[PDB]
Nucleic acid binder design. Sequence first.
DNA 1: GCTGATGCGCCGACGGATCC
DNA 2: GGATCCGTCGGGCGCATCAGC
Length: 276
Amino acid sequence: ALYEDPPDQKTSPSGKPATLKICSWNVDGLRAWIKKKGLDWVKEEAPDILCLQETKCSENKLPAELQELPGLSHQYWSAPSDKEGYSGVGLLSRQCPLKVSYGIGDEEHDQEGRVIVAEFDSFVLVTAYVPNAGRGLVRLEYRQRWDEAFRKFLKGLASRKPLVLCGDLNVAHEEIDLRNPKGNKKNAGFTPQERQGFGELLQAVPLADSFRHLYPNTPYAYTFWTYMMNARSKNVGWRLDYFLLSHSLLPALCDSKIRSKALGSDHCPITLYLAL
DNA sequence: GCTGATGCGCCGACGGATCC
DNA sequence: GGATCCGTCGGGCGCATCAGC
Ligand SMILES: [Cl-]
């Protein structure tokens, strides 16, 4: 094994207090998640920015509860045009972004509902639901092409303001990032191809893995557990959800949390504290 | 309108073999 | 002959569509 996330560090290496709290959560069905009180948990966490993945919900079907969030009043939603009930992302913010956009280059023709970009005063935020390689790796080659496209897209963005990338990146980067590495190397989420993609993402953009930066040798720290086989109760999981940061933001990094106890999905929330 | 079946999407438990 | 390796297979949950009434 079980894992207890350590206490929230709220000051930066140079002693500046955190001013920004970002929470990311793959809710695996937004409407279900709300019925399972996920928004009650969000209110307790009181993030400045909330990023949601796999909402499986078009904007017209959003529960009214989402309109009763005074501290997260600026909301942006995206869902795929031809795969309703799959993917879907959202970004909710206390302050209004300067700019918001969707997708990674051609969303207007291939409306996939997987990526939101929001530019703020001091940084650019990207949230993503990266395509799964699929059972039997049936869509691994697509995933590899998508990874390349995404890397190139982010390279452009990071060329201006610093970047924060968060969400479900659908890969456990290294063996320490899942409970059962030995038997899962032919499984979605832990192929050599997906792991290499993540490494290239870090090197090319470039980005740092906030959690692993702070906790380089900490095992059993996961963000996903299959609903099957009582996996969550046994902490047999995978770290699939990340906050990746430009190197220039590392002096602003206070902590990167895994909110293991928060229920309502097969993923748990992750939370970032930055001193901006 | 409402329910429940079906379709689609998205790995860890176990049994047998192998290793010394 | 306990530990490990490795291939096989049984399996939770959400949401869309469909049939039925
Ligand atoms: Cl929107």
